[model samples]
Target: MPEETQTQDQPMEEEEVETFAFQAEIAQLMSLIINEFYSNKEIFLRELISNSSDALDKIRYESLTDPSKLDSGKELHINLIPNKQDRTLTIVDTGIGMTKADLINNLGTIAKSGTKAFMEALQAGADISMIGQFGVGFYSAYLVAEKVTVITKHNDDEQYAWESSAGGSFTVRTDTGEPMGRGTKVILHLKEDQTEYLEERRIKEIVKKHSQFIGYPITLFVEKERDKEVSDDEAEE
Candidate 1:
C-alpha cells in the first residue's frame, strides 16, 4: 500500500465530475501493464469478459436472497458492440453495478488486495496471467485503449461515468449519456493501431478462446445488411 494515498477531490468544470490521482503503486502497475504486457493485448478482452461473468454470478447469487436486485430490466448477460466507424469497442453487462464508493475505492486504488506480492511477481518474472488475480484485471484495457469510459449504475447511487487515460489520474462524474437499468458499460477508445478489435471476427475469436464456458450469454451487436442486428451467444462460436 502506498502510505501517501490521498484522494484530491477537485471538482471539474461541470461541477459533478470529480478527478482523482491514482495511487503511486497503481500508476506504476498501470504503466507496467501497458509496457510489459504488450505481447498479448488480446487478453484485455478476455479479462473484461471474465469480469462480466463474475459480475453476473454475483447478481444471481444476491438475487436469491433479495430478489428485487434482479429488478433491472435486462436479463443477466454480456453485450459486446464493436463500432468500427467510431473506433470504439463497448462491453456492457447486466449485473450488480458499482456505487460511487465502489468506483473510487476499487478503481482508484489497489491496496485492498495482495498488490505487494503481485508487484513482486511482476518484477521477479512476469506471469501476466496474475493480472486478474491481483485486481488489476480492469486496467488491462489500457493495453489496447487510448481512453476508457466506464458508465455504471448501482442500486444505491445514481448512474456515473469514470474516465481515464491510464496517465496516473482518473475522473468520475454523474453519467447522463445512456440510460441503463442496473449494470456497467465499458467503452474503449481503441488505439489507432489496435483497431483490429473493431471486427466481430476478432472479438469472437478472443471470446471463444478465453470465456467459452462463462456462465452468462454474450450478445454481440453486428450490423450487416440488417439494421440493429445482433449475433447470439458464445455457443455460436
Candidate 2:
C-alpha cells in the first residue's frame, strides 16, 4: 500500500503525459486547420445559429405534449454582443442548456469523426483540404479563443459555468444566478491573432450564409460611440 501511494504521488513524465492527451496530434495540427479555415471562420457563427435552431425545436416539441414545459413564447432568438474595450464576443441563446454531463461529453471529447478520418488520409497522401470537409463548428473556437467560458442554466437543474483555455484541464462550477431560462451562453475571449470575428458585420454575414434556414431570429448588436455635445455659449465665445 505504501509503494502504491508513492507511485501515485510521483510527478508525471512529459512523454507519459502526451499519451492520454485529447485529440492527440490534433492540437499540433491546429495550424493546418486555422490556415485553411481563416477565411472559413465565418462558419462558426452559422454553426452556432444552427445549434440554436435545434434547441428551439426541442422546446417546441416538448411544448406540444405539455404546454407548461414551454417557457419563452414560440419565438426563438440568438443575440450577439461585442465589447471592444474588453475584447470579448458573446453568443447567447434560449435553447436547452446542457447538464454538467452534457458539457463534459460534448466539449471534452473529440466529436468530429470526419476530421480524424481526414487526418488519417493526409498520412496516406490525400489532399489536406479534405479536413475542411469535416465540420467542428464552434470547436473551431479553439483556434481563436485564448479562453472560453460557457454559462448555462438547464431547466431541470441549477445554473452552472464551464471554463477552458484550450489546455488539458477545464473547470465547472455553479454560477451566481437565478437560472438563465434554459439556454447556453458562450463567451469567447478573443486572442490578438484573431480579432476580426469581433466585428458585428462579419458575424452577421456568416449567420446569413450558414443559418438562413435556421428557424429563429438572429440579432447582432451595433454599437457606435457618439460624440459629446458642446455648449452653444462656448462656441459663440
Candidate 3:
C-alpha cells in the first residue's frame, strides 16, 4: 500500500500534443498519393488554386442569402509566393476559411462529408455549387513539400494552424498571429527534388497551362532585375 501511494504521488508526464491515427486504408491511400499517384508534381498548385476558387464560390453563394455572412474586407483573389532564400512556396486566398473541426474533418480524411453533402444536394435538385467534390487534391501538396502548414481564419471560429508531414497524422493548435479576417494561407516547405516550384517562371507557366480558366485571378510574386546605372567617369574610359 505504501508503494502504491509513492507511485501515485510521482509527477505525471502527460503528452501536451493531440495526435490521431489515420485508418489503415486511409493511411495507405495517402501514402500512395504522396508517393506514386501524381505523374506531374506541378499539378499540386493548380489543385490548390482550384480549391481556393471553390471556397470563394461558397462565400459568394452564402452572401446571396445572407449579406452579413460575407467578409467585406477581403477581395476574391489568390497569391502565390515562391521564396528561394527560404525554399518555401506559399498560396494565399481571401476566401472561405475552415474552422478547427473543419481542418481535422477535412484534412485528416481523403473524402470529406462536405463534398458528399454537396453531391447529394446536387442529385436531389437542391441548388448548390462547389468544385473538387473530392478532397484528394489537397494531398497533392505532399508531392512537392516535405511538410505543409495551413493557417486559416473562418468567421465562425478562431484562427488555427494545421501542420503535417504527409505522415499518418497531423497537429492542430491555436494561431497567435494577426487575424486573417476571412481566408486561408498554405505554406509548403519544399523538398530538394521539388525546388523547381520555387521558380517564378515555372509557377507562372504552370498556372497558365493548368489554371488559366479559373474564376479567380492567380498572381505570382516575381522579382525583376534592372541593370545598374553606370558612373560618368567609368563610361568615359
Candidate 4:
C-alpha cells in the first residue's frame, strides 16, 4: 500500500515535484540488494544496457503493426555518454518511454506477495542472478550511483522526469528539460567512491564484455585528441 501524504516539492517554477515512499517490504529489499547482493559493481552497466535493449525491442514489436507509433522515425540504438567533469554517466535509447504512473508502479514497488520469499532467498546466500529474473533490474543502478534520474517521453503521454536517491522514495514531475521524443535517458550521478564509471575506457570495456552482441547498436560517446600537423615555425613557437 502507498503511504499517505506524499512529499511534494517545487524544484521548477512551473512543475510540481511529488515524491513517493517505497512500500515497506520493497524498501528493505532494495537495501539488502544494494548493500549486499552484487559484488562486481561494473555489472550495473550491463544490466542497464540490457534493460535499454528491452525497451527498444518493445518499441520494435509495437511499430510492426502501427508504423505511426514510431516517434521521430529514428533508428533503434543505444547511446552512452560519460561526463568526467560532472562525474555522471548517461545511457539513452530510442525506445518506448514511461508515463508518470508507469514510473510509480514499476519503480516504487517490488512484487507485493513475493518480496518476503525474495528476501529469504537472499538471506540464505542465494546467488544474485535471481534479481534479473524478478524484473527488478533497475535497482542495480544504486550499486554505483548516489542518485538516478530518468527522463522519458512516450508517444501517448508528455515527457516526465523521475528522480531518486534510491533511499526509500523517488520524485516524479513533468520534465522541463529538452524533450526526448520517444525514448528514455537514464542519468547516474556517480557516488564519490564510484568514479570508475565516469571513465570512457571503463564503460567501453563493460559494454563490450556484456552487451556487445545484444542485437542493438550500442554507441559510446568518447573524447579524443591528437597532435595536429603544424608548420615548423608554428611547432617551434
* TM-scores of all predicted structures: 0.74, 0.63, 0.68, 0.74
Candidate 1 error regions (>4 Å): 1-16, 66-74, 112-117, 121-126, 223-237
Per-residue lDDT for 65 in model 2? 67
lDDT of 3 by residue, 178-203 (tens): 56666687877878776554666765
Candidate 1's residue-wise lDDT over 1-237, tens digit each?
343325533344477457677666666667766677477556555565666677777777867866555544445677777776567677777776444556667653557554465566666786777566556455666776788887776543455777866776777766655476566777878776775546677666766767656756778785443565444347664
Candidate with more favorable, higher lDDT: 2 or 3: 3
Residues 89-175, candidate 2: write the lDDT tens digits.
Answer: 777777663445656565424545543555566677775333333433245567557888888776645556667656675566555
Name the candidate, 2 or 3, with the larger TM-score value: 3
Candidate 2 vs candidate 4: which has greater lDDT? Answer: 4
Candidate 3 — which residues are off by over 4 angstroms?
Answer: 1-15, 34-39, 65-70, 108-133, 222-237
Give per-residue CA lDDT, model 4, range 1-237, as digits (tens): 433334453555543557667677666667776677547556555555566677778877867766565444546777877766566677777776444555767752546786656566676776676555456655656766788887877654555777766776777777666675566787778777776546656656766778646877778884432365323254454
Cα shift from native, residue 155, model 2 (Å): 2.6
Error of 1 at 36 (Å): 2.9
The C-alpha lDDT values of all candidates are 0.65, 0.59, 0.60, 0.65
Decide which is better by lDDT, 3 or 4.
Answer: 4
